Amino acid sequence: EQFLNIRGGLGLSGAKAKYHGGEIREQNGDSLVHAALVAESAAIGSAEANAFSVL
Amino acid sequence: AGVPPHPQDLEFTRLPNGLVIASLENYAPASRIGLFIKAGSRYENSNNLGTSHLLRLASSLTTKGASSFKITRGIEAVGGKLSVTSTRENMAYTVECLRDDVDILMEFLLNVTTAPEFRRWEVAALQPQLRIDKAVALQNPQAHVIENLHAAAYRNALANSLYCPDYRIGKVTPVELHDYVQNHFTSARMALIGLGVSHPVLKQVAEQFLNIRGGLGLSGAKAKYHGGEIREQNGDSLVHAALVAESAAIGSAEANAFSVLQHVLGAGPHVKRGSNATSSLYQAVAKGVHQPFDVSAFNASYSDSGLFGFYTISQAASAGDVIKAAYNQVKTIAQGNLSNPDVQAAKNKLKAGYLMSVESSEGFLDEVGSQALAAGSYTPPSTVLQQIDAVADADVINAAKKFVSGRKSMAASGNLGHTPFIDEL
Amino acid sequence: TATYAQALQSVPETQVSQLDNGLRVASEQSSQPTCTVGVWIDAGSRYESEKNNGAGYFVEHLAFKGTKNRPGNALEKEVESMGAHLNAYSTREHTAYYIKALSKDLPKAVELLADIVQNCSLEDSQIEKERDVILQELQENDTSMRDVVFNYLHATAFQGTPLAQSVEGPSENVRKLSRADLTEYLSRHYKAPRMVLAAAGGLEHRQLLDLAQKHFSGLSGTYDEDAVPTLSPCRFTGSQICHREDGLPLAHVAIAVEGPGWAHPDNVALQVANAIIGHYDCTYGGGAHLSSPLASIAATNKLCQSFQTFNICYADTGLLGAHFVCDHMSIDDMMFVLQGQWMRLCTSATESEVLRGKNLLRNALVSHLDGTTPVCEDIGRSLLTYGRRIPLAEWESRIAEVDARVVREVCSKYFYDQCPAVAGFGPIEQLPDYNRIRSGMFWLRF
Amino acid sequence: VSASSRWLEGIRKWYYNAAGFNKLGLMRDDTIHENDDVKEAIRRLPENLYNDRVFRIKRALDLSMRQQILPKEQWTKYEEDKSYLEPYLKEVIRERKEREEWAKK
Amino acid sequence: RGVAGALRDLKRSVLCRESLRGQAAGPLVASVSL
Amino acid sequence: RGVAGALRDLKRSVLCRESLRGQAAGPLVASVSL
Numbered sequence A: 001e002q003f004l005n006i007r008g009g010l011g012l013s014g015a016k017a018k019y020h021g022g023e024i025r026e027q028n029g030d031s032l033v034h035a036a037l038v039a040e041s042a043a044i045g046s047a048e049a050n051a052f053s054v055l
Numbered sequence B: 001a002g003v004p005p006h007p008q009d010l011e012f013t014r015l016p017n018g019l020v021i022a023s024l025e026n027y028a029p030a031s032r033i034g035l036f037i038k039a040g041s042r043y044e045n046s047n048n049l050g051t052s053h054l055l056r057l058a059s060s061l062t063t064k065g066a067s068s069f070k071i072t073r074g075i076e077a078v079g080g081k082l083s084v085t086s087t088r089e090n091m092a093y094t095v096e097c098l099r100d101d102v103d104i105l106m107e108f109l110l111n112v113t114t115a116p117e118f119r120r121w122e123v124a125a126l127q128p129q130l131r132i133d134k135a136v137a138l139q140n141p142q143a144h145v146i147e148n149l150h151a152a153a154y155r156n157a158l159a160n161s162l163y164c165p166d167y168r169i170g171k172v173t174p175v176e177l178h179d180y181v182q183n184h185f186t187s188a189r190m191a192l193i194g195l196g197v198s199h200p201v202l203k204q205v206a207e208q209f210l211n212i213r214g215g216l217g218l219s220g221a222k223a224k225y226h227g228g229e230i231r232e233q234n235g236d237s238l239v240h241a242a243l244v245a246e247s248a249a250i251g252s253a254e255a256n257a258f259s260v261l262q263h264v265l266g267a268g269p270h271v272k273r274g275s276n277a278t279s280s281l282y283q284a285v286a287k288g289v290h291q292p293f294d295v296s297a298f299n300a301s302y303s304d305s306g307l308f309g310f311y312t313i314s315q316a317a318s319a320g321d322v323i324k325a326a327y328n329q330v331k332t333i334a335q336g337n338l339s340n341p342d343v344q345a346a347k348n349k350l351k352a353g354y355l356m357s358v359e360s361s362e363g364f365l366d367e368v369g370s371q372a373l374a375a376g377s378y379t380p381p382s383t384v385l386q387q388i389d390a391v392a393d394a395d396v397i398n399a400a401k402k403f404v405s406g407r408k409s410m411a412a413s414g415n416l417g418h419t420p421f422i423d424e425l
Numbered sequence C: 001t002a003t004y005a006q007a008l009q010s011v012p013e014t015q016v017s018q019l020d021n022g023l024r025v026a027s028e029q030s031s032q033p034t035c036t037v038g039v040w041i042d043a044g045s046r047y048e049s050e051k052n053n054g055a056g057y058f059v060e061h062l063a064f065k066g067t068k069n070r071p072g073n074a075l076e077k078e079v080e081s082m083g084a085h086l087n088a089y090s091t092r093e094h095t096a097y098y099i100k101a102l103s104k105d106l107p108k109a110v111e112l113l114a115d116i117v118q119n120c121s122l123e124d125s126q127i128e129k130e131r132d133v134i135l136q137e138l139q140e141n142d143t144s145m146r147d148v149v150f151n152y153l154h155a156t157a158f159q160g161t162p163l164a165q166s167v168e169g170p171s172e173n174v175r176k177l178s179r180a181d182l183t184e185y186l187s188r189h190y191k192a193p194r195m196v197l198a199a200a201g202g203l204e205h206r207q208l209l210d211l212a213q214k215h216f217s218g219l220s221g222t223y224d225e226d227a228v229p230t231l232s233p234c235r236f237t238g239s240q241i242c243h244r245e246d247g248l249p250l251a252h253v254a255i256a257v258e259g260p261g262w263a264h265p266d267n268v269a270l271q272v273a274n275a276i277i278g279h280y281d282c283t284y285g286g287g288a289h290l291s292s293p294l295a296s297i298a299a300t301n302k303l304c305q306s307f308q309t310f311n312i313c314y315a316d317t318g319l320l321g322a323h324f325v326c327d328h329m330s331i332d333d334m335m336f337v338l339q340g341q342w343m344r345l346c347t348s349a350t351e352s353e354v355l356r357g358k359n360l361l362r363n364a365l366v367s368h369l370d371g372t373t374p375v376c377e378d379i380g381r382s383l384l385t386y387g388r389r390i391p392l393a394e395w396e397s398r399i400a401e402v403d404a405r406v407v408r409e410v411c412s413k414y415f416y417d418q419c420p421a422v423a424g425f426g427p428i429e430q431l432p433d434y435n436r437i438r439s440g441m442f443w444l445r446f
Numbered sequence D: 001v002s003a004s005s006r007w008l009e010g011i012r013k014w015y016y017n018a019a020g021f022n023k024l025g026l027m028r029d030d031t032i033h034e035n036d037d038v039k040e041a042i043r044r045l046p047e048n049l050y051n052d053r054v055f056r057i058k059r060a061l062d063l064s065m066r067q068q069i070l071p072k073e074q075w076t077k078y079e080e081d082k083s084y085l086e087p088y089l090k091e092v093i094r095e096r097k098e099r100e101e102w103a104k105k
Numbered sequence E, F: 001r002g003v004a005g006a007l008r009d010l011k012r013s014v015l016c017r018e019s020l021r022g023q024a025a026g027p028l029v030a031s032v033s034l
């Protein structure tokens, strides 16, 4: 209440994150290939997110 | 009367081993000879990327017949020149000199291309030149975009860069240079062109020294068009962007239609500090964009594929407006809004441009060498204008249709906060 | 077979004719479908006073913007429609407008050039729009250290004279140049005996003369009573200008002594000596094995990113020297090696290296006159400077006369114990003092 | 060609053992004086030959400090001495002579 | 001198619309020499 | 000491299959300190 009563600024979460899809490939000749493949799943705090955690 | 003599017409020969010789005696004070090779960066794979770049930089390294010192001093002694020009499909080893020194520089040319030693220490000392050479090229933003545009467009071969990937600088080995020369610098992949040289001399040289067998077949693996986008956020002052679709392989009739479409949309300026009145892309963007910008049709044709589209330069905030205005202008052409005076003027720009591109010996030699590898023949200018005249307006509209409906490839660099993705077009 | 010498005889003679008004018409016929044709005017910033120093460059911005017959972009549409290319440039002594077009379009190309050089409509609305364009170009040119340092070299070398002025003019001039200043410039300099209608390509000299009498007879060949401009000689001054700016990553340095001019026979030997010193870029492949001592030393020791020698000619004067670009801890070594080579050639030029410079110049001459446009420029410009076209067979004769003695005598005449003009820009703390530079122009051992 | 050749080679093997650098495990090319031609040839040596040259010289300097030699089993046999540096040095010399011949014209 | 052609040290700045025309690319080529 | 966690000087080499388990990532975090 004394020191962290800061006003002004911006609203919460700013602009919404727009999922797109796409691929980025980095040819570097490392010894091993690292790869990640994903899809949009669920926002944290939703019940669907627990299902992904269990999956 | 200062009327000149009757010009001698070019001579052409295909040897049974696949090699092509083409000479033209223009009786000029200087001679020009070039060995064109199907050895561009497309023939690299993921294990030896950059090998053709280092090879392009190694023409003065020691050979079996000429030391590195002798190649540099012997050519400079007679005021000659040695150059290595490389595209995604070809490498072109060219040598220039006065008439009386052709024997000297031919011998150097043959040693560079048929007997390099790739000495381990000489190669090691050359590796840092890849970084210098790449850095000098990549201070044009256009070089970034076009290199990324091909990487995004293709899955292999044409995706390969003309410049060595940074991770390979210092890692290209003499064995890789040896292997690259041995299976790409072969008779069926070569063309020996000479201006100010007799045909018997070139034919003698070709049969004596350029009868190289073995190696690999022609064109290697086929280029698989993919589609995609590569975006480089770097905060440059201006946004450069290129948007293309697969168009047509060089030598096909459909490729002339794309070439004519390029000059309908607007390829480059004809008047110094002009408004580009007859440039349909520039006027389309100029309507709703008052800030500075540039826009140009892009046309790149290859042995087994092609890319057509446009290239934009604009302020970062106007990037989307310029791109969407340019894309819609192509759509109206695909919708059939194309007059006959428009296509006739474009043929004039194209036909005039081709003839102007072959008035110099340098530009003539590159065209003959390119035709020899692409087509296996020489097509004179009058026949080229004939093929240009044969382009119908419906062919031009259909090419524009192919671009609008085809899966797109895009590359852009700059502050991309207002540069759209493909799916936003 | 054919030899180099025999090939020089096969070059067609450049035909020359002069109209009744004084317009000179020159052409070199080839067997080409294309051609280049243009008008070379003996006008530039050396003819301009301090008041109107930016007028000719301003006129270049207005030449292609409209005429009395083809207003607006009408000219621009005709050139683009027939696939032709229209271009122009201005120097301190010469102005040129030329068109690249199909040979069949030569009658129209000549018509447009006449319309531009005579009936240029300098509309006030257009003059004001080209005002802000030129000012923006001045901001762009400030970022080219090469263009800056060479304008600095002229500014100090020819200080107090017309040649000290830049082609584009000062910022202040562009914001007060009026239409009367530009028309006064045009009506005073664009006279027929100072213009040359040059052409090159597939064309008969007869038709060029017909088009000349057709579209240029309507030109004033009668000078004013006593308003014929005459170029005063320009005093060269041994001096130095140093724009220290450590925020820039590389230093640019231009050094030069006074040359003789366009028509002096000594230019051939001077160009041979500059060919021995040559040029260098960090992207060259030769490196350590290059013949030029300056180039090989610079490559092996990383003394610079580039250098070039030059011999810039004007009427009865010129700038003979070199320019280079380097890291801030290398300016002194580059100056040392550069001057050492000048002194070495003045005193100890050998025969074999001189044959090198002769051969480089032969290749440079022949390789440059390769195409309709470079030949058309050599026609138009040569008729202004030399008053004639000098055939390649004549240049070969002058080059062959050169041996080691000629280079030692010619170089000593212009380099040895002469006061140079120095221009520095960038991180130039290590740029040697002028006295030390001046002391580098002689050898105590000689 | 055994009669006259083996006597010459016999005197060379005598001198080789008399020189005594084999007693420190060294080879002939390890003992050459480093001038500019030799520094370049050493620079051109591949990784393994360079590293072997370094350790043999290091082992010999260690012996020279202690005024010792290797046991006789570990001496460099005359027939097994490899002139690993000579071919590189010959090329370096051939290159320098080419430069010098060009500097004469 | 090293070349990069695609049209068919601080380098410099392009500000106005007149000095941008010709810059838009129109198939890259890379050339090296002595 | 600076951290990069994502699992839920030549560094070293991973060769066998036993030493690879645990390396596959499983949402990056970056941490700095004194």
Ligand SMILES: CCCCCC(=O)OC[C@H](COP(=O)([O-])OCCN)OC(=O)CCCCC
Pocket (backbone or CB within 6 Å): C439, C440, C441, C442, C443, C444
């Ligand atoms: C026996 C004399 C030996 C030569 C010594 C000498 O003259 O020094 C060189 C300078 C003048 O040469 P420079 O400085 O013009 O450089 C010319 C290089 N091209 O002279 C000086 O002013 C130095 C003062 C020396 C006094 C002891």
